Structure 1
Amino acid sequence: VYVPDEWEVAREKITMSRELGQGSFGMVYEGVAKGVVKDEPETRVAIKTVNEAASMRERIEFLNEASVMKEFNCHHVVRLLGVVSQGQPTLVIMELMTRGDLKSYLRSLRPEPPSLSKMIQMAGEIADGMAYLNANKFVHRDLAARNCMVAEDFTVKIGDFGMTRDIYETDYYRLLPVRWMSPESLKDGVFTTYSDVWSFGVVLWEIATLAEQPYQGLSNEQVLRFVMEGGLLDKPDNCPDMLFELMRMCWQYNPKMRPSFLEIISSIKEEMEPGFREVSFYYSEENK
């Protein structure tokens, strides 16, 4: 039973320019919202709509999942700006990421690549956002280049998690990214910070291959068998040892033996850009 609040915005103030493509619950539009940002009368925003093929059960799921993001304030996690809970379509307005998803972006760099220092940068930003989320007791469950977003200034941020969330799970039992999923996720549907770290390893591999499909030539059923039986992605051609060392740490079959996101950041903080100190969660007062 969603209760409107602070975050509720008048539908009047919102303007939907053009389609950006399908996200978790429905179409995401580019647009403009009046007075959703302080010291900014009008703001360029992304607007996700729940389609009209949406059960009340799903329209409520949409708002509650969005509402999780109300508690989030992190430079490396895409920000919620406001909610339109009354009337249809139900809107969730958020920070517009003007260079789209990291997968598309990485695909665009293919024989027109990124330097080692530019890849470490992406890794640390993603790791920092994920460290922030795990600090706020949140497991993403769908970390992947396609759900990392790129800002105007090339900052990478943690994006859509909706895609994997069922309406019923927790209380009752009845969509899985097998190529990004840890063995314990594939075997038992266990999703923890440590499973998110596995996915993070796969995103490094995506970054180093400019978004090849992980385990290409294996079907989804084959990947499920292969990874559960200790299968691993081959080190990409001319992948820096720095990075492949990180992938190996993330792909420890046993979750206990995987590094935390903080440990990952510690291991690369030397090679991070100077700015990262001011914007990051890692260096923030909020970090433990």
Structure 2
Amino acid sequence: ADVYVPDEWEVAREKITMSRELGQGSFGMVYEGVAKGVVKDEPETRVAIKTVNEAASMRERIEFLNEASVMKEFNCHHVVRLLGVVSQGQPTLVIMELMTRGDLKSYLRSLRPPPSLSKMIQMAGEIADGMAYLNANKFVHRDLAARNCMVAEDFTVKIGDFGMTRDIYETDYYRKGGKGLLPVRWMSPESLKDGVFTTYSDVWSFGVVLWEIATLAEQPYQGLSNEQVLRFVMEGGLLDKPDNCPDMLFELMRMCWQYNPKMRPSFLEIISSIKEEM
């Protein structure tokens, strides 16, 4: 819209403190912190606070709240929970459940120096729970990667979005035609060719996340450039079975990377498929 209309999700600047720093978000810096009177039965609650650039335009501020207004509808334990908005005041804030172990790509890379089929299959099921929920509330994530999946103190996996502007995952984006950043290494053929983002194109990215878990977050298509990735995937090229990859997990990957998007499974079908095995 041209406007944002404050509602009861609003929470006073007073009750938000910020501790350390979490990363460069799209509209501003993101910080860890603490928040009061936002989950009653808890006096203080540990949160993540994303912020709007002091510089950044008003129509950019509207653009920022309206994306977090989408999260007010949501109620899935495998999607990072919205706790509040702080629109009235200078630094324009959104508060969120704090996922203590940060993003799934750092967690998998932290295990390099195997994990069990079981334990991998689990993560796959928890990611697919969130994603099934999202596709059902008519949300297409269009940047599902392990770096946007978030981990909890208990090692539970929740779907998130940390945007494209973190220095730490710069190799993971290509300014194609020199326009906006594109996570080309994760993108369906149809998303690469024609710019078509669907439930189905999320199921392609989910197959790359499976590949990330199996490899412990190796760079997909290592030793190809972004232009070479484009060509390879647009021509029906696929990823190699990771070394030591269980059969059951690589078969999900293939299913998810059908060229024809209507050949691929729904998240709902993926959840079914794993759930027979537990």
TM-score, length of structure 2 as denominator length: 0.92
Rounded Cα–Cα distance in structure 2 between residues aligned with 1:25 and 1:89: 11
The one-character-per-residue Cα deviations of 1:83-126 (angstroms, maximum 9, x if unpaired) are 11112211110000000000000000002x31110000000000
1:83–1:92 Cα contact (<8 Å) kept: yes
TM-superposed deviation, 1:262: 0.6
Matched, 1:269 2:271: no
TM-superposed deviation, 1:271: 3.1
2:173–2:183 Cα contact (<8 Å) kept: no
TM-superposed deviation, 1:38: 2.1
Q: Which moved more, 1:160-169 or 1:149-158?
A: 160-169
TM-superposed deviation, 1:164: 9.9
- Check 1:218–1:172 CA distance in 2 against 1; reply closer, same or farther (3 A cut): closer
Unaligned runs of 5+ in 2: 176-180
TM-superposed deviation, 1:55: 1.8
Q: Identity percentage over the alignment?
A: 100
TM-score, length of structure 1 as denominator length: 0.88
Rounded Cα–Cα distance in structure 2 between residues aligned with 1:172 and 1:55: 25
Rounded Cα–Cα distance in structure 1 between residues aligned with 2:271 and 2:61: 37
Rounded Cα–Cα distance in structure 1 between residues aligned with 2:66 and 2:25: 16
- Check 1:185–1:44 CA distance in 2 against 1; reply closer, same or farther (3 A cut): same
TM-superposed deviation, 1:20: 1.4
TM-superposed deviation, 1:56: 1.6
Which residue of 1 is the match for residue 139 of structure 2? 138
Rounded Cα–Cα distance in structure 2 between residues aligned with 1:170 and 1:31: 29
The one-character-per-residue Cα deviations of 1:169-213 (angstroms, maximum 9, x if unpaired) are 999999211011001101111000000000000000000000001
- Check 1:24–1:114 CA distance in 2 against 1; reply closer, same or farther (3 A cut): farther
- Check 1:253–1:172 CA distance in 2 against 1; reply closer, same or farther (3 A cut): closer
Rounded Cα–Cα distance in structure 2 between residues aligned with 1:184 and 1:43: 42
Equivalent residues, number: 271
TM-superposed deviation, 1:161: 6.5
Question: SS of the residue aligned with 2:38?
Answer: strand
2:149–2:159 Cα contact (<8 Å) kept: yes
Question: SS of the residue aligned with 2:85?
Answer: strand
Rounded Cα–Cα distance in structure 1 between residues aligned with 2:64 and 2:88: 13
RMSD: 4.3
- Check 1:164–1:134 CA distance in 2 against 1; reply closer, same or farther (3 A cut): farther
Rounded Cα–Cα distance in structure 2 between residues aligned with 1:169 and 1:86: 33
Which residue of 1 is the match for residue 178 of structure 2? none
2:79–2:159 Cα contact (<8 Å) kept: yes
The one-character-per-residue Cα deviations of 1:249-285 (angstroms, maximum 9, x if unpaired) are 000001000000010011101334xxxxxxxxxxxxx
Q: Which moved more, 1:85-94 or 1:118-127?
A: 85-94
Rounded Cα–Cα distance in structure 1 between residues aligned with 2:162 and 2:235: 27
The one-character-per-residue Cα deviations of 1:231-263 (angstroms, maximum 9, x if unpaired) are 111110010110100000000001000000010
Matched, 1:228 2:230: no
- Check 1:166–1:205 CA distance in 2 against 1; reply closer, same or farther (3 A cut): closer
TM-superposed deviation, 1:60: 1.3
Rounded Cα–Cα distance in structure 2 between residues aligned with 1:189 and 1:91: 31
Rounded Cα–Cα distance in structure 2 between residues aligned with 1:138 and 1:164: 21
- Check 1:193–1:119 CA distance in 2 against 1; reply closer, same or farther (3 A cut): same
